[PDB]
Design a protein around this ligand. Structure first.
Ligand SMILES: [Ca+2]
Ligand SMILES: [Ca+2]
Ligand SMILES: [Ca+2]
Ligand SMILES: [Ca+2]
Ligand SMILES: [Ca+2]
Ligand SMILES: [Ca+2]
Ligand SMILES: [Cl-]
Ligand SMILES: [Cl-]
Ligand SMILES: [Cl-]
Lengths: 140, 140, 140
């Protein structure tokens, strides 16, 4: 009965955090923002410090969840993808090539100097430099 | 030692949420509000979306907990009871007849068109229509 | 697989709370404040009500964590130590003699009527009366 209780209590705490607007759950992932806007490198640091990672959508469902955060907070969001070494070749921060995409029409159109990806409030993507201030969204 | 640790960490997270004023614990139940006022149907949706249910007190202790939220937020609260099909016969949303009551004197006095229950800041109840804006309180 | 899941979900909720700025984790301890300032006795009550205790640093790492809260909230903080019965002899609230100290130069200089300990925003300590208003920081 220790284990049933443990699960119930976890469900309660997650429920509270969800109600408060502090987390969104999509499958195995939890997304969260504290509402702050900073550049891409600072978002990475902020998420890592919290024990998570800069958010990236790998499915339509995850894109929709992150989009809803962009919408609720009315700001563009940096995503956990880059095209550093290879150009036009976006990779997650774990090194793996991106699969799911949701590019805004015409994108990625980027310079060799647009190594980051931002999400617009409508959930679509634009390759961009990494020094803009964007909503910090993390995944856990 | 995995299990002891797990319990400690749950206690910590619940402690934090409690300190922050984001949850109240009464026996097996956790109550929470995000401070928003909406109608009865929208409260149900909001609580369900968070993984919970619109709050209802089934004991004096639960009434007191929900009352304290009504007081802290200075608003009347819709409770998880209705008298839809039967009239004067209040039921929880699980279909079961209500046991514990805390009616304000003279109540329920309601029209066939007072199918919901609201709680006043003093913890007492009034049957009411369901289209008023009331503090959203959920249970998990 | 129930147990792995349970651990992941706990890590997620702690991550969210950390991101939100609602908790700091140092070893086995979690520190949190709701931002309120009250006297020493009221802090004890507030922390106990949440299921925790008034915070006290017992290591350099814990002092630094509590200092960062003092800094972020720009207020002095009461710590969980007193010199009630014995004078000049500080004890934790569990009765045990204090080990780690971080006194500001000249302190403790206190009257027999400075039975509490406050922390300055720079992390150093001053013995003080207990009736001042200080930032409430709890440990769990
Ligand atoms: Ca590029
Ligand atoms: Ca572009
Ligand atoms: Ca009625
Ligand atoms: Ca009535
Ligand atoms: Ca003294
Ligand atoms: Ca002093
Ligand atoms: Cl840029
Ligand atoms: Cl109405
Ligand atoms: Cl004083």
């Amino acid at each position: 009965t220790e284990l049933y209780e443990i699960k119930h209590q976890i469900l309660q705490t997650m429920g509270v955090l969800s109600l408060q607007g502090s987390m969104l759950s999509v499958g195995d992932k939890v997304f969260s923002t504290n509402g702050q806007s900073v550049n891409f490198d600072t978002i990475k640091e902020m998420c890592t410090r919290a024990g998570g990672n800069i958010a990236v959508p790998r499915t339509p469902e995850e894109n929709e969840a992150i989009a809803s955060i962009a919408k609720k907070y009315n700001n563009y969001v940096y995503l956990g993808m880059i095209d550093d070494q290879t150009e036009g070749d976006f990779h997650y921060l774990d090194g793996a090539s991106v699969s799911y995409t949701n590019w805004y029409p015409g994108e990625p159109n980027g310079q060799g100097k647009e190594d980051c990806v931002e999400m617009y409030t409508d959930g679509t993507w634009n390759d961009r430099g990494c020094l803009q201030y964007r909503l910090a969204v993390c995944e856990f």
